[PDB]
Inverse folding.
DNA sequence: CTAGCGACTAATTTTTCGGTTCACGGTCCCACAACTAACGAC
């Protein structure tokens, strides 16, 4: 699940808040599997 | 010291593509321009 692309955010425009883990990610977005770098938090993985 | 002896080259034609013409219902920071409320002078 990518937050980037047409109609989405940009790496330069991406603040810290969108990259963190929300309490609503529980069971929907994995709080572990994210890229380690400039794309952290902006690219997430679906939960099982 | 000398002589006898063992088929290629030039001229003319023809054809496809391009040119031309006609032309109605994100963030943070540093400057710059307004700009206005208050302050002072005639």
């Amino acid at each position: 699940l990518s937050a980037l692309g047409p109609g989405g955010l940009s790496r330069e425009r991406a603040g810290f808040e969108v990259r963190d883990v929300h309490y609503t990610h529980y069971g929907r977005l994995c709080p572990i599997e994210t890229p380690e770098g400039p794309n952290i938090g902006l690219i997430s993985s679906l939960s099982v």
